[PDB]
Amino acid sequence: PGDKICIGYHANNSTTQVDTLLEKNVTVTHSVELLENQKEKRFCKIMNKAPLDLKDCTIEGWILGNPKCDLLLGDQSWSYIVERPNAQNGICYPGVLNELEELKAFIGSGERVERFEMFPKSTWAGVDTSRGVTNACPSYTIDSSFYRNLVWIVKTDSATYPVIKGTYNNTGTQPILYFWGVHHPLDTTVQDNLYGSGDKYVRMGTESMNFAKSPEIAARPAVNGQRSRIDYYWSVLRPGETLNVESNGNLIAPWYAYKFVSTNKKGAVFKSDLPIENCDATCQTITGVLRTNKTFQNVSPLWIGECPKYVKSESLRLATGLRNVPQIAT
Amino acid sequence: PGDKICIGYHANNSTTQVDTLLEKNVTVTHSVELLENQKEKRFCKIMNKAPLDLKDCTIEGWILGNPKCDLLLGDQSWSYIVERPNAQNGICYPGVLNELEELKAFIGSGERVERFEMFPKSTWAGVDTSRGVTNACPSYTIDSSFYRNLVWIVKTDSATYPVIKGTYNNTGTQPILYFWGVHHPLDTTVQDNLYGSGDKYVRMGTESMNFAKSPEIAARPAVNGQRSRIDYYWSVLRPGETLNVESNGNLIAPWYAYKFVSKKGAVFKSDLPIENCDATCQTITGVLRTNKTFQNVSPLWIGECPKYVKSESLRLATGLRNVPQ
Amino acid sequence: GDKICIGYHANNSTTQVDTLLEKNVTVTHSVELLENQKEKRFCKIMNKAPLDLKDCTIEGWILGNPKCDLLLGDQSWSYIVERPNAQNGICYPGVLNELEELKAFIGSGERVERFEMFPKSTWAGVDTSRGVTNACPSYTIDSSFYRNLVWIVKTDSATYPVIKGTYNNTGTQPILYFWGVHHPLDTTVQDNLYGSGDKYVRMGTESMNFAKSPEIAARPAVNGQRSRIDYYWSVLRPGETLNVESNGNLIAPWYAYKFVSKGAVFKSDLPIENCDATCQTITGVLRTNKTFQNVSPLWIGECPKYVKSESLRLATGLRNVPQIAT
Amino acid sequence: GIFGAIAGFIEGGWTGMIDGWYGYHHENSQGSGYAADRESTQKAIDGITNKVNSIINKMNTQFEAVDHEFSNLERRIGNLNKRMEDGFLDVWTYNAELLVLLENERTLDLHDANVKNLYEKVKSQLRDNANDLGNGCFEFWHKCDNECMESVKNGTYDYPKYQKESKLNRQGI
Amino acid sequence: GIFGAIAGFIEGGWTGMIDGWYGYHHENSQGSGYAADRESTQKAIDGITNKVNSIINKMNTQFEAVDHEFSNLERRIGNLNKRMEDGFLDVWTYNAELLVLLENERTLDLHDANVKNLYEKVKSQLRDNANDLGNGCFEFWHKCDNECMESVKNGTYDYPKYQKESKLNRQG
Amino acid sequence: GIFGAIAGFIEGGWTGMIDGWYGYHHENSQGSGYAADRESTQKAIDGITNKVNSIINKMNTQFEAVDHEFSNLERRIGNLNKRMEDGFLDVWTYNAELLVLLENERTLDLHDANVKNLYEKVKSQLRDNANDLGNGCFEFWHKCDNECMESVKNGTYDYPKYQKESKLNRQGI
């Protein structure tokens, strides 16, 4: 009958709930989801730079120059690297690439390489170059080939294999990443056939590095039709450093090598089979692009670029409005 | 004079206290202690499964087959390993077990091994396989014996020591943990006596592993009467992988090896008793049998344990402040 | 009529705190928990001076580069200061194998006592007086060598015989010691310095073995040298014995250190002064009672927790709403 | 609710009050309707917004996981990396989840406090010139037209002005 | 306390009220006694129970220490492991101890709030049919029966029914 | 204010009350002034000092970073060490900064509540023997002694004793 004034609060048709320490499933009038769970299942360009697709080649197959990896041969610039889980073309002549995990880590570092001839075949005197080829390393065109960045050196028709020497002096401003190897015959017979007689060695050095290896001869279980092995090695010739190569025999020599540009960016190698497309991203995880404003994400801990913090949560919804208590309509 | 109704709150006999940001030692009517500080000082079964007691042997003694670790010899299944600190039987013939810490880590993380003969003594032709024994490795019943898992191969009475060869192809589904060694005489006299003359080597290889080593003759300080040394090695032959062995001397040959089956694994170095009990949570200093969320006993455990913190107590007030009259 | 009013304190304070709800709130009282100030120098910790390596690096000191003679002998330190510009380290070119592990072990010490481990008379039939090189001058002699090593060469007429030596550690302290292996540039220097034929360096203790032979090849010239030395270090445990045996190319241990073991190694150019500190960071002393510091994560002594914050001011007083005076 | 107003002595909300969090509902001879109290609503909005931006701010760093490979002789450091990364993942998950639960409780209490305060503010102006119905409603003991309603909302209600009228009505009933 | 009721204007608790956290004391011609408010007590138990279970649930992960061995050339990563494990140990010890201190402070305030709001529930029913003393207590201006006391606790107290009787004695 | 007193229904603080946080301002025929309530001030000082010491105590551990070098074959473990140290730094920076923002909010609320509860302690004592002005002030309907002021402050105010004088004034007006 009389004039009323009442104090109250807002309600709405919101059905969104939050949890609190004291109570679960509290419907509130307004809230914000702080966690992202959506992704685009693909790889895009970071800082407008395209990632390197290694396609059917592993990281080894790539930087050694596996003959089937010619599509990748030469200059490459990348924001990150993508290596397909079942790439076939890696180390084709059986053997170990020594310090492999630390090489993969170093390559992940770079934003760019320049291929160039480091030791011309003429460098080595008194030996045969052009027979350094194998059936375990076909190209797509030829059944017997070899890595594009290494010379498998063999003694010429004279029984002796001479001492050979090689020098390269990095007068540049960039570190140089380069590879060599030491061949290990399954036979003393094969050893004699390919190299001299007597104690053989491979020695190398710089102002800050030594290396000495001799052959270790034995029959190993066949791989790619080979019971012999090659020990592969890698190194980084700093700006202003000089390399000296000296060998008695069994040298697989450096032929081409890379000027190496290290990156401001953190760098990444993603093992994945997701597509690479002509798109741009700010945040690239290993399982996808996050395209978001949110603070948290549940997609992946592994990423390059600017991503939200990774958590295990399914949802992180913050209440901003109040407990929603709308009148029952009937 | 008038009737009264009063609003008020519960009080009780509780002397239990909690701390808050604003005040310490606040007596409160009801509360819950979240931290467990009590333990059974023993080791118990975990998933109804007993631990391996290595007794008087170290991990090295056991898997190399130190002659006084025969009580462990053979197949084993375990929920976690207990190595006793003062265990005396390990590497009996002096020498270094290469990549020891990484071997110890691979072993824990196992749950079971099956011992089998990988290379029959007949594998190596033209050599004596019966004389490879030393007084540095006695059994309990003979003064001069050797590891059960290795054969110290030696020259035939009639010289010389030929090239010997052996292969094993892992056809099963389980990885194989195996061992070998290279002998390093203190003398050229012992070198000549045991093996031939000439440059000796031990070379091994699989589809993914390369090994080559030559003897390094020198007198080292005497240990267990020996100034010679053996370099010991281990490896893991993956399912599908073949092992090739080749040597013309100084080879301490793989003999027995282990099928190895791989949760959380634990090597507890302790002297606590292993008793006939069961448990869900075992720490290095004992069993926790508790529903509490936190524990102050140990950061090292196997099973489902509460979270370790340095706290002495974590009591949540549930009740109100206690103010009795 | 008569008033009674309820109210709260106000004051002249213009100091502000932040809140989850509000920024820049002026409060009557508050405490800053963070320390952002620092004395830009190195001081004694626990009344114990630091070791200033000066113009030498850790390699130059502990191998005994001839230009590091000021450092020679016993040292006690609360921490080490290595100057970033230090020129004197490994003078004769080559690798100090396991360098980082050596630097960490030295960092974990507080004292070394220098002592002759293998007198030159140890090695019979060889020349222990001729082992000097132009690559390691002292400040007075153009050709010298490390004070802690002897570069042994064959006597005036060949040959270089097997040489042997033992040291038994009967002491209570671990001994840090060094040796090396010479790698001549060519066979000619190998034959001049040492005997013809295969050469070895072999060493062993109860728990460690070592074997190495010369890797002969010409490397890029470094301090006039195309040859190299491989340097090595080890720790002889109390009760352990060391056997050394070589027929050539041995750079022998001469002097070694009884070693007494969280110290720190500061690479810095800050001055060391006649001052005392409770807390020392790599960029200076903290003299403070605060709980947090943004000066550095790297320190020795008792220092507050390092955080990246500019200020951590805790309101203790209430919001300040003083009367407006005109 | 902790201040006891929301879902408390005031049972339900108003879908009709569309322009604010907290408000007045009025009825008089002139009419009836809803109005947000602007001042308290805008202060709560500023506060809540600062809270959200503070949280976003403080949560604006990221632990970096990495793609490094380990060999079969690197089990210990491989597992070290693994427990390290999982370690920080578990700590940050804990921090975000506990923070949201805690801040969600306090944010609802804040709203409950602003409603309660808005009600106490009106209550003390009106004194005994109005009668408490329940549910946060007051019935005036006098006529309260639109200007009088506005002065309650403004904080300028004139209790002396209507006192005599209120007293006469309070008696006869 | 922060809502001022507990250890505040209601100076003490009741050892007599056994069956609840918060509640009522009455005196009348028929006697005197204690009765818990079932609804606010259960709602508090529900809240506190949920908080304890949220805390237990969120603390339900463990950092795992390992006792891998390290060689004498592995002082750096051995030390790295140690600092790493002591580092997580310190964070969780911090997280648990601070949470307990904070939550304890807030749970005491929650109880205080609940007592305060019960006091205000009663006060609002009774209006001027009773006198509010300093202490959480109301002295009736009328005779309040056991039935009358029950209706106060029920929220079904009948103010107009006693208005005239209360007016009178208020005037005496 | 969340309890609404500070910078709320009590608009400002008193630079004239210098010996406490919370207080009474009185005016009477015998004079006027500002006097702190010692008990509520001291309790808050004990409480706030304990909060500062608890936080200082709970923050009394350090994470220690290290000067270790890594070689050019130790990029992975060198980067492991950096991410770990950075990770622990980010965690402790977060904990300290969020703790400060959260505890400052709750500290100011504590002060607000202590003022609100002093104000209610007086208002229940006085009942209709005094008139509520705004701003936390009461005007007595009777003559209030220094002794009477003290009885309001210490909690022993005698309402019967002044009820008749007060009523005759209250509505002789």
Ligand SMILES: *[C@@H]1O[C@H](CO)[C@@H](O)[C@H](O)[C@H]1NC(C)=O
């Ligand atoms: C929240 O409540 C709903 C039912 O209202 C329930 O399905 C859900 O499990 C609760 N919590 C979750 C999982 O978010």
Ligand SMILES: *[C@@H]1O[C@H](CO)[C@@H](O)[C@H](O)[C@H]1NC(C)=O
């Ligand atoms: C490599 O080239 C630089 C530039 O001319 C030269 O100074 C240096 O001597 C060369 N290295 C050596 C040791 O010859």
Ligand SMILES: *[C@@H]1O[C@H](CO)[C@@H](O)[C@H](O)[C@H]1NC(C)=O
């Ligand atoms: C308090 O009383 C209960 C009820 O019998 C009894 O079980 C308990 O042991 C007593 N506790 C204390 C703290 O005295």
Ligand SMILES: *[C@@H]1O[C@H](CO)[C@@H](O)[C@H](O)[C@H]1NC(C)=O
């Ligand atoms: C090992 O055995 C399998 C099947 O028994 C055979 O297919 C494989 O070729 C063998 N591997 C080698 C290298 O002998």
Ligand SMILES: *[C@@H]1O[C@H](CO)[C@@H](O)[C@H](O)[C@H]1NC(C)=O
């Ligand atoms: C509530 O109170 C009435 C008296 O007013 C009583 O008769 C009834 O039984 C009580 N019922 C409840 C709600 O328990």
Ligand SMILES: *[C@@H]1O[C@H](CO)[C@@H](O)[C@H](O)[C@H]1NC(C)=O
């Ligand atoms: C409280 O006030 C009364 C009235 O002034 C006074 O007599 C009494 O001593 C005071 N009580 C105290 C200080 O406890």
Ligand SMILES: OC[C@H]1O[C@@H](O)[C@H](O)[C@@H](O)[C@H]1O
């Ligand atoms: O080039 C030598 C090779 O020739 C291949 O045909 C043969 O299958 C291999 O086993 C290897 O002998």
